Structure 1
Amino acid sequence: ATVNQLVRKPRARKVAKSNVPALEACPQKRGVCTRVYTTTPKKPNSALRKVCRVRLTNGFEVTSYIGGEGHNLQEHSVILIRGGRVKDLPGVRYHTVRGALDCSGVKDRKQARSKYGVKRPKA
């Protein structure tokens, strides 16, 4: 590893690729939302995690989980993507932003309202 060596072949960095190609390094993207599924989770866990195939604006048919209990996404439901991989759901590296666009928000929610988009209850 003598100096010379490095002088002729300098140290090489790397190119850690984005774990989520939401393109242009955008905080969020809009999608048409093709279909809505309920695939089963991975190995250790078991349930019916509700996911949906969205069609991003730039044209990147990806998937995204629907946090919170109960949603309302149907067919041509315009929604926003957040980007948050889900372990029990392979292929799912994004999260559908709740409360935004055509996507509603978790009702009856109280604790942690910001997430799942929910305005203050009342008083």
Structure 2
Amino acid sequence: PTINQLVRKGREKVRKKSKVPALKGAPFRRGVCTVVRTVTPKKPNSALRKVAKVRLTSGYEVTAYIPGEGHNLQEHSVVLIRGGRVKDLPGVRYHIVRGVYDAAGVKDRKKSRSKYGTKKPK
């Protein structure tokens, strides 16, 4: 377009749409589970994934997917979450953090333990 136009209308510095609103610009928000259960994914997969619906100090309430195998999550379980969705599971945008609060890490897990809150054996 004309330089004039660029002088009249300039160009639009399009901003970003955050992908974790329920956080309120925070890296971690505590919640309290409300609907511990399983959730099937959309194609092309099949399973029964471990979801957690959590109310937050941010007032909101969102599904948080429980990573790993075997957990200890039921209603009233103090928990923490993190940013990160699960492509195949619409309705889930955030993760939970094992080994934190009323959530414990994975059992007999030895590799990538950090990502699964599981301390060191012998």
Give the strand-richer structure, 1 or 2.
Answer: 2
TMscore range, shorter length: over 0.9
What's the offset of the Cα at 1:88? Answer: 1.4
SS in 2 for 1:55: strand
Does 1:119 find its partner at 2:109?
A: no
AA in 2 matched with 1:2: T
CA distance in 1: counterparts of 2:102 and 2:32, whole angstroms = 10
How big is the shift at 1:19? 1.2
Contact 2:22 2:58 in 1 (8 A): no
**What stretches of structure 1 move > 3 A for 4+ residues in a row?**
none
The two structures have a TM-score, normalised by structure 2, of 0.96
Residue in 2 aligned with 1:83?
A: 83
Match of 1:67 in 2: 67
What is the RMSD of the two structures over their aligned residues, measured on CA atoms?
0.9
* Alignment partner, residue 56 of structure 1: 56
Residue-by-residue CA offset, 1:75-99 (whole Å, 9 max, x unaligned): 1001001111001110100001111
1:31-66 deviation line (CA, Å, top 9, x unaligned): 011111201011101000110110011111011100
> Deviation at 1:103?
0.5
Partner of 1:53, secondary structure, is strand
| SS of the residue 1:6 aligns to | helix
Whole-Å separation in 2 of the counterparts to 1:37 and 1:18: 28
8 Å Cα contact 1:22-1:83 kept in structure 2: no
Q: What TM-score results when the alignment is normalised by the length of structure 1? A: 0.95
Structure 1 residue 23: deviation in Å? 2.9
> CA separation in 1, counterparts of 2:24 and 2:94?
15
Q: Which has the higher helix share?
A: 2
How far apart are the structure 2 equivalents of 1:23 and 1:94? Answer: 10
Identity %: 73
